[PDB]
Coordinates of C-alpha atoms and ligand atoms in Angstrom, one line a residue:
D1 CA -11.0 0.4 8.4
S2 CA -9.3 -2.5 10.0
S3 CA -7.3 -2.3 12.9
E4 CA -4.1 -2.9 11.2
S5 CA -5.0 -5.6 8.8
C6 CA -4.1 -5.8 5.0
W7 CA -4.9 -3.2 2.6
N8 CA -6.0 -6.1 0.4
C9 CA -6.3 -10.2 3.0
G10 CA -9.1 -8.5 5.0
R11 CA -6.8 -10.5 7.6
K12 CA -4.2 -9.2 9.0
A13 CA -0.7 -6.7 7.7
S14 CA 3.2 -6.2 8.6
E15 CA 4.6 -4.6 5.7
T16 CA 4.0 -0.4 5.5
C17 CA 4.5 1.5 2.2
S18 CA 7.6 2.6 1.9
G19 CA 6.9 5.8 0.2
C20 CA 3.9 7.2 1.5
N21 CA 4.3 4.9 4.9
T22 CA 0.6 4.5 5.3
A23 CA -0.6 1.3 2.7
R24 CA 0.1 -2.0 4.8
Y25 CA -0.1 -5.4 3.2
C26 CA 0.6 -9.2 4.7
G27 CA 3.3 -9.1 1.4
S28 CA 5.0 -8.0 -1.5
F29 CA 2.5 -9.6 -3.4
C30 CA -0.4 -8.1 -1.8
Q31 CA 2.0 -4.7 -2.7
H32 CA 2.2 -6.0 -6.1
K33 CA -1.8 -6.4 -6.8
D34 CA -3.2 -3.2 -4.6
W35 CA 0.0 -1.4 -6.2
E36 CA -2.4 -0.2 -9.4
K37 CA -4.6 0.7 -7.3
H38 CA -2.4 2.5 -4.7
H39 CA -0.9 4.8 -7.5
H40 CA -3.7 6.2 -7.7
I41 CA -3.2 7.7 -4.0
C42 CA 0.3 7.1 -3.4
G43 CA 2.8 10.2 -4.8
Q44 CA 1.4 12.9 -3.2
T45 CA 3.4 13.4 0.1
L46 CA 7.1 13.8 -1.6
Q47 CA 7.0 14.1 -4.7
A48 CA 9.9 13.7 -6.6
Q49 CA 8.9 11.7 -9.9
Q50 CA 7.8 14.7 -10.6
Ligands
ZN101 ZN1 -2.3 -10.0 2.4
ZN102 ZN1 2.1 4.3 -0.8

């Protein structure tokens, strides 16, 4: 676990998952690339989609 780094790039991240406020990324593309994997642990905080 790096200090404020992109979950994919490994360099640096500025954006944060708006759905869980946890995941961090440097861009929209990075979020989409990891998004597929992200759904494995995302969507279990608010529980709206059901
Ligand atoms: Zn990135
Ligand atoms: Zn998320």
